[PDB]
Structures are given as structure tokens and as C-alpha cells.
Write a protein that binds this ligand. Sequence first.
Ligand code: SF4
Ligand code: SF4
Ligand SMILES: [Zn+2]
Ligand SMILES: [Zn+2]
Ligand SMILES: [Zn+2]
Ligand SMILES: [Zn+2]
Lengths: 294, 294
Amino acid sequence: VCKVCGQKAQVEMRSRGLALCREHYLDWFVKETERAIRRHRMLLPGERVLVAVSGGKDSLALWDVLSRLGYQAVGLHIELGIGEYSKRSLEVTQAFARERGLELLVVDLKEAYGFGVPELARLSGRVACSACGLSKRYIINQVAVEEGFRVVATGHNLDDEAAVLFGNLLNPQGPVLPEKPGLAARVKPFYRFSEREVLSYTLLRGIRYLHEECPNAKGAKSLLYKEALNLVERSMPGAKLRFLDGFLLRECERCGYPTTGAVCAFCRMWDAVYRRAKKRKLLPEEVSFRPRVK
Amino acid sequence: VCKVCGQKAQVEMRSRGLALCREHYLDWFVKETERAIRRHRMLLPGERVLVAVSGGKDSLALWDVLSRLGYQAVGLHIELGIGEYSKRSLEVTQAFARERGLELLVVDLKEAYGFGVPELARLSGRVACSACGLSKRYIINQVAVEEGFRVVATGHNLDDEAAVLFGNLLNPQGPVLPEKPGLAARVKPFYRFSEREVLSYTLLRGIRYLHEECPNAKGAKSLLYKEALNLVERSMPGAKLRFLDGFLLRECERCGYPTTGAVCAFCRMWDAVYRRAKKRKLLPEEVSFRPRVK
Ligand code: SF4
Ligand code: SF4
Ligand SMILES: [Zn+2]
Ligand SMILES: [Zn+2]
Ligand SMILES: [Zn+2]
Ligand SMILES: [Zn+2]
């Protein structure tokens, strides 16, 4: 029975030994989010915040909640140029913002830099997710800083932090990443939430999100870790949360942004990519890579 | 191809990127065992050692190797009184010692204490494995000390240590446990070995072991952890070993053996068991529990 009203429970959280009807689950989820924000001084009451929005359940849900709590939540979507996948992601995301009258910023990777994640992978030599991850972190930050956002929110959740933690133990982040001179802050307001929890909010709130996952991968290390931890969690609710809980610079020559070297990894990657595009005659020889500067 | 001779490989160890024919796998396993013994000063050349032998693959294999290396390896088996299971375990174990002319010590739990692990569980209030585990640790030690063994060896392996480590991270031991006044030392010479590795040695050496597992459990926490870690290991060989590696008193009033209280957990358990047997008229009222003393 629902713990708040005593009518039919629509969501059960064995992790928390808690059951709620639709309305009170939705109420709890939102309130629990505002709790994380306050417990870690993540945001200011109506603060502008740049939300990294993929079109997936977590980031749409997050965009949804932060609005509800009255923050000025601007979304940033990055069209990564991964085929129909990147196309659908953008569509969904745009559909979402359109319906809610939220403002959406979009960076199209091929229009801005000349190559989509696939060609970027082939040319940089990195695995697609390495190139892609690096490209996502850089551009979100740059967009943030360029547009005056003190802070940036991602929809990373309990499953993510625990999977990451587990990955490190096998192969040797905090709710708030502190603002620095060339770095906006990164808050994860869904850090305590289960994936199943976020998915529940998303379904009960009627949010249409992109069900398709990205073609690669499909061999993700993160996925392997999540299965193994879910296999445990199923039989031992609260395992992930216990696990987690238990445990707890220079300016780039090309672009001005923070790095521990002369040239940042991002500039270093697009530099080489451009160089090799030239050698293979894909770019004119007199073209160079000019990153936007701080 | 086998790394030592170049003929057909019979065992592959992706964990180690190593392949060996039967003869050279057997040679490697034995030599790797003698390595663990020396690297951690576990044993002396012909030292007497009490081997906890269940009749399973690990302890028979271990009993086999320690003999081969010329240690005086006496086995200890505990008939725990768990139905046909405890019966078969004893048979297998006896068959093994008989064929190799090794000496086997046996403690039958019902003959010594009056109850088998099942009744022991019901009467102590503990889950069978809690009563059983406590009973096994106590009796092995007592037998060791009573018989003048400085040291005791168990067949616990990499899978076991990693499963245990994982269990603690979710729900908050060393190769050598140091001899103390009332405690013989405990060496695990198979601590670096995979389960699959030990099983391989066992099969290639032609050792007949007890394939049946114990009726409870069948819900083991240790089992859950091992699956989840194997699920990872399959896709990422060396995960367990990385995981592991990365990370790295008073006398009892009744019985004289070490404890952190007045009466040790073992004496405390059999005491209550006897008391409740009396109340239920299963023991005469004038009978008391007299544990053997140091
Ligand atoms: S999966 Fe790899 S490639 Fe596909 S989006 Fe996430 S990171 Fe970029
Ligand atoms: S499983 Fe539980 S009960 Fe069966 S033997 Fe191992 S410990 Fe004793
Ligand atoms: Zn309710
Ligand atoms: Zn740079
Ligand atoms: Zn060989
Ligand atoms: Zn005692």
C-alpha cells in the first residue's frame, strides 16, 4: 500500500523499502531531488543551469525536474553525427523542449568541426566512445563558459557512479565538481537515484524519451559493470547504495581552456584529425583547426 | 600451442595469457603453489600440516599438491551430519586418503557433540551455515592445537578471496594467518589460483572429488558474488586478480581457547543448544556440555 496515502502502490523501491502511488512517487522523486541539491549546495533558487540533454530518460527527466523546481534550465544537445541515432536523439530532444517551451542550445559536430564521431574515431585513432566522450566533455564546458553558466547538470545516477567505482576497482565522481577558472561546475542531482527509479519517474510523468541506445557500444565496459551489480542488487536490495556509500593546471596553447599539458587533449585530437584529413585530401591544405577561445 | 613445449595446449588461462599441455599445466600448478608457499613463508620443507579436507576439488587438490611437495600433510574431515551429503563427502575423502596412503583424521559432529548441523541450526537459532561455519573454524583449530600442528592449510582460492572482498564492499583474508597462543596458523596456498585453474588441475590429475554441493545453500551470498565477478571476468580476463591485487584477546571461561568475550561464540552456542535440548527433553537434565580444554 502507498506509504503516504494508503491507496494502491504503483512503484516499489525495495532498496528503500518504500512504496508509493503514482502521485506520491512523483512527489517524492522531485522532493528527493531538491534534497540532493540542498544537501550539496548544488544550485541557487532560480539559478541559470545548463543541462546536458541527450534525449534519454535520465537527462529529459532531469530537465523536467529542474524546471519544476523553478531553476532556469537551458538544455544543450550535441548532434554527434552517429547516423539515424543522432538524428532521432535530436528530434526527441527538440520535441521535448518545444512542448515545454524550454530553450534548447544545439551544437552539430559535423557543422562545427567537419566530422561526425564515426570519421572522428577513424581519423583520431581512438575508439569512437573515447573520441566522443572527450568531445562531449569539452563542448559542454565550452558552451557553459561561453554562455555564462556557473554550473552544468548531468543526469548521471547511482547506477552510473557505482558502475564507475566498480570499473576502477577492477581496472586501476562527486555530486558536485567545483567551478574553476576555465571550468563551469558539474552537479549530478540524480546521484542517489537508481536507474529504475529515474525510469519510473520518466514513465509516470509521461515523458517521451529515446528508447534506442547508441550503436556503439554494444560492448560498453560500463554496461558489463551494471549487469553484474544489478545481478547482485536483485537478490540484495540496497547493494549499490551500500557499496557506494561505504566507500565515501595550465591554459591550453591553442584554445585557452584548462589542461595538464601544453595543448589540451581536445585540441590535440582535432589537430591530428585535421592533419590526417589533409594528408588524405579531405580538407584543403591551407585550412587549419581554429578552436573558439575563452 | 603449449608455451613450454609447443605441442597441443590442453588448458588456456586468458587471465595470464598462458597455454599449457597437460604435463606442463600440472607442472606449472605445482610450481606456482610452491611459489606461494615460499613468497609468504607459509611452510617448512617437511613440516607437518593439517589440511582441512571436505572432499571437494580445492581441498583434495591441495592435499594432493602439499604431499607432492613432500610436506607431512595430514587431512582433517568433519562429518557435519548433513544427510547423504555429509555421508558422500566422507566416503570420497576416505577413498582419496586410502588410495594415496595419507592419514585422515575424522571428527563426527553428532558423535562428539550430539547434534548434526541441521539440529544445531534449529536449536542455536542460527542459520545452518552460521552454526556450521563456526563449528568448522573451532574444531579445525582445536584439532590442530590438540595435535601439535603449528599450521593449518585450507584450499581457499582467488575466487573465494575476491568474493569475500566484494561482499564486504557491498555489506560493510591474507594468505597467512599468524600463529598465536591458542591459534594455529592458517595458510591459503591456492590464494592466487582461479577456481577454474584448481578444477583443471584436479581433472588432469585424475582426482575423484565430490561433485555434489551442500543442500544449503542454495542461496549462498558467496555464490551471488562469484557469479557477478565471473560475469565480468569472462569479458575481462584478470578482473578478479586485478581487483584483489589493487586493494592489497582473552581465554574462554569454558574451554580456554581465544575469544574477545568471557565465553567464546562456540561454547556459547553449544551451551544454549544443550540447554534448549534439555528444555525440550532431548538430553537428560544432569548432562552438561564439557568442551575439550587447551
Ligand atoms: S556510446 Fe560511445 S559513442 Fe555512442 S554516444 Fe555514448 S559515448 Fe558517444
Ligand atoms: S554450505 Fe553452509 S552448511 Fe553446507 S557446508 Fe558449507 S557451510 Fe556448512
Ligand atoms: Zn499515495
Ligand atoms: Zn585546447
Ligand atoms: Zn607442454
Ligand atoms: Zn570456548
